[PDB]
Design a protein around this ligand. Structure first.
Ligand SMILES: CC(=O)SCCNC(=O)CCNC(=O)[C@H](O)C(C)(C)COP(=O)(O)OP(=O)(O)OC[C@H]1O[C@@H](n2cnc3c(N)ncnc32)[C@H](O)[C@@H]1OP(=O)(O)O
Ligand SMILES: [Hg+2]
Ligand SMILES: [Hg+2]
Length: 355
């Protein structure tokens, strides 16, 4: 079982020096990721949410960042689900070398994917029952909407900062989740793609080119397309789907709109209506190898205080990247904050993948 350090270096340029930040929050007991339904024999007992924020630096300059949320949902002193929600991924082009951002991300997901679900449960206070890893349903959800910046304010400037476009960006993640499906899930895992830009048979035309045999247009919350959105759509942070659901609660329509019309109406919300190409990817299956990794001090650093967490992360999402000064400052601040208030050095690693 590899470490984050082993995973990373394995996909970063050969013999090159990089240092990374693996910031995790303290597992928290919060509300159901999906609005509960009274007429449902099943209503979750516990929904443990926790955030993973990663950062990669190259010679004192941060150039990439990934914001991921993991939801561990427990139902009947036996059943459990772990949803890995990819929220934000951004670059700022300030690394003197060229790296495969597509690969870094995939590997960071393979890592988060290998974390034993009880790792999050044990940290929760008071103690929360433990489920069996070999049989926890695992899901990945992501919403691809290309943008200027997401974690690095104003990095849009920096002449050389590749920014994919809706479609380009949709084939990028596509490649990643496909690679994950192939080497991490079982032969019967649900793999869904849905582009509310329409062309139902155009999505199909694209999925044909995937390696995993089971991609299908659709999402992983839609079973019976006539069910009510509210009881099936998950409400993630800063997510477009959640946005629409709260709109639907203003207009007292929650009880009226079905999943079917939900997607049809989701597009015209100014978030779409032609404006850029957005897609919704989803995976729901069982891991190939049962997850049993418990992150170390080297794999993850967990500031003990939601405040201290927000502080460290602020040092990245709070800079000015209209210039390379920000990339340098972000680095400095973190390395310095770590070494001076947590007695910890940014994990360092030499590349390893040839060309
Ligand atoms: C979780 C979410 O849904 S978030 C939404 C996505 N986020 C955003 O749009 C935020 C802004 N966007 C970005 O910061 C960037 O576009 C990113 C992070 C998405 C992409 O970063 P990149 O550096 O482009 O990715 P990576 O290095 O893996 O691939 C780009 C390289 O692949 C190559 N490439 C170009 N076309 C292709 C292709 N069809 N197939 C494979 N490789 C290609 C080029 O080398 C390109 O390098 P360039 O930057 O000199 O043009
Ligand atoms: Hg670079
Ligand atoms: Hg794997």
């Amino acid at each position: 079982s590899m470490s984050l350090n082993d995973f990373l270096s394995s996909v970063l340029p050969v013999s090159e020096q990089f240092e990374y930040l693996s910031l995790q929050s303290i597992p928290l007991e919060t509300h159901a990721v999906v609005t509960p339904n009274k007429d449902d024999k099943r209503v979750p007992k516990s929904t443990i949410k926790t955030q993973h924020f990663f950062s990669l630096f190259h010679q004192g300059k941060v150039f990439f960042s990934l914001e991921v949320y993991v939801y561990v949902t427990l139902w009947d002193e036996a059943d459990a689900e772990r949803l890995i929600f990819v929220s934000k991924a951004d670059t700022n082009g300030y690394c003197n070398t060229r790296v495969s951002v597509r690969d870094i991300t995939k590997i960071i997901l393979e890592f988060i994917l290998s974390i034993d679900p009880n790792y999050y449960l044990q940290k929760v206070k008071p103690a929360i029952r433990s489920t069996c890893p070999r049989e926890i349903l695992t899901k990945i959800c992501l919403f691809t909407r290309p943008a200027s910046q997401y974690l690095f304010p104003d990095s849009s400037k920096n002449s050389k900062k590749h920014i994919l476009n809706g479609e380009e960006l949709m084939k990028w993640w596509g490649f990643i989740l496909d690679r994950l499906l192939i080497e991490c899930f079982q032969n019967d895992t649900q793999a869904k793609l849905r582009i509310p830009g329409e062309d139902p048979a155009r999505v199909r035309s694209y999925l044909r080119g995937m390696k995993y045999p089971l991609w299908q247009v659709g999402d992983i919350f839609t079973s019976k397309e006539n069910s009510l959105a509210v009881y099936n759509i998950p409400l993630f942070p800063d997510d477009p789907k959640a946005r629409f659901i709260h709109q639907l609660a203003e207009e007292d329509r929650l009880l009226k709109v079905s999943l079917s019309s939900f997607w049809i109406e989701l597009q015209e919300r100014q978030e779409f209506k032609l404006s850029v190409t957005s897609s919704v990817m989803g995976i729901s299956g069982y891991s190939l190898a049962t997850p049993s990794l418990f992150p170390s001090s080297a794999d993850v650093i967990v500031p003990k205080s939601r405040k201290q967490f927000r502080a460290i992360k602020k040092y990245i999402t709070g800079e000015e990247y209209d210039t390379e000064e920000g990339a340098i400052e972000a680095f400095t601040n973190i390395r310095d904050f770590l070494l001076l208030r947590m007695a910890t050095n940014l994990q360092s690693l030499t590349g390893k993948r040839e060309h």
